[PDB]
Design a protein around this ligand. Structure first.
Ligand SMILES: N[C@@H](CCC(=O)N[C@@H](CS)C(=O)NCC(=O)O)C(=O)O
Ligand SMILES: N[C@@H](CCC(=O)N[C@@H](CS)C(=O)NCC(=O)O)C(=O)O
Lengths: 214, 213
């Protein structure tokens, strides 16, 4: 059977996976799982994934959540060669490093600053914004030294980080200080297969939803 | 030589010290005093611009992010496939649990305790509750598997045991979680070098907590 992906388009973690699947060359059967209306909280979804979250991959009964685990699973299980996620232990470690940066530092700080404001009606906190800036400073630093985030080729880590950066852009955060981010971002938009469909449109939709909600 | 810049009370540092024991990698430990800015010297920053620990320096190859260092030691020096299986599906279960550990378990612990320990803030019982939720999910994982990602000790058990030992050290109450507690016993015994790598640092962290608290 085709591999199912339970997802919503505006979700950056979901876009991580959409991008990885396009880059690897995997067709997914997309199962829209609307969170507003609780589709992740049905009895059948809970049974599939006790954490009741998207993305959830179901590859013919093999089920994963965690976007970044899903990305590397697709790449190793279905990739034609290892360019997007090298077998070499050192190059692979660099990609993993930046995937953890993306989760724990970049995307975490974005969510910390923006989700309570968007979903909880909380004031946008300047201290929290600052910490998202600090994360952007680091990423700009990475990209000063290398063409892509984990080295000289586009890898899974650029795909996750672009999903996060496009989301940060979509809430109208000012990316103008980060010249290396900006140059890289243009490069990834052109290089990442299926960029516009897998990421750009969902990110733009997130931005619309942010405006509406705030 | 393979250097580790660290402090022992840090759960992310213990993540690595555990992995290093399990894989069988000797590390030259370089204690890094954070309170006096040793991670902020020019030399450090040159090595790791994020100025954080753990930092690994494997003969000039530099990494930060504990969980990436863990899987690097296995990938580069590993002799036991069962610790971090090469099979893509088994490996993905290990990876899934590592991301659970950073993004759900340890995240929710840090959100609940760090503001209090490091910010003077009072403990928010709703944030503690979200840590509870993460522990509920973990306890569930362990209902139908011996270890967090399958039937063998893996790198994911080692990260999660660093996290749970930290959670225990702040006197959070783990008695409701029967599967976590059974698993925790097993890992303390199964993980090579567990006391050296993890116990004293978790105890240290707990003392620090009690002092700052
Ligand atoms: N760390 C996870 C995050 C997944 C996540 O945050 N999903 C959100 C949507 S963006 C969700 O499904 N929330 C519903 C829930 O957890 O109840 C990943 O990378 O996949
Ligand atoms: N996600 C990183 C977190 C590392 C981390 O937060 N280290 C702390 C100690 S527990 C630190 O070095 N803080 C100093 C700083 O960030 O400037 C990992 O897993 O290694």
């Amino acid at each position: 059977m085709p591999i199912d992906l339970y997802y919503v388009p505006g979700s950056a973690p979901c876009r991580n996976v959409l991008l990885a699947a396009k880059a690897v060359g995997v067709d997914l059967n997309l199962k829209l799982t609307d969170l507003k209306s609780g589709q992740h909280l049905t009895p059948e979804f809970i049974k599939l994934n006790p954490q009741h979250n998207v993305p959830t991959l179901d590859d013919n009964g093999f089920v994963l959540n965690e976007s970044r685990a899903i990305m590397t699973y697709l790449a190793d299980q279905y990739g034609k060669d290892d360019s997007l996620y090298p077998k070499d232990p050192k190059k692979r470690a660099k990609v993993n490093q930046r995937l953890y940066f993306d989760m724990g530092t970049l995307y975490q700080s974005f969510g910390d600053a923006y989700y309570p404001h968007m979903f909880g009606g909380a004031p946008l906190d300047e201290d929290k914004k600052k910490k998202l800036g600090d994360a952007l400073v680091f990423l700009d630093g990475f990209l000063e030294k290398s063409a892509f985030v984990a080295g000289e080729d586009l890898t899974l880590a650029d795909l996750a980080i672009v999903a996060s950066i496009s989301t940060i852009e979509a809430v109208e955060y000012d990316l103008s200080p980060y010249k290396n981010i900006n140059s890289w971002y243009s490069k990834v938009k052109a290089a990442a297969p299926g960029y516009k469909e897998a990421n750009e449109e969902g990110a733009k939709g997130f931005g619309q939803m942010f405006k509406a909600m705030t």
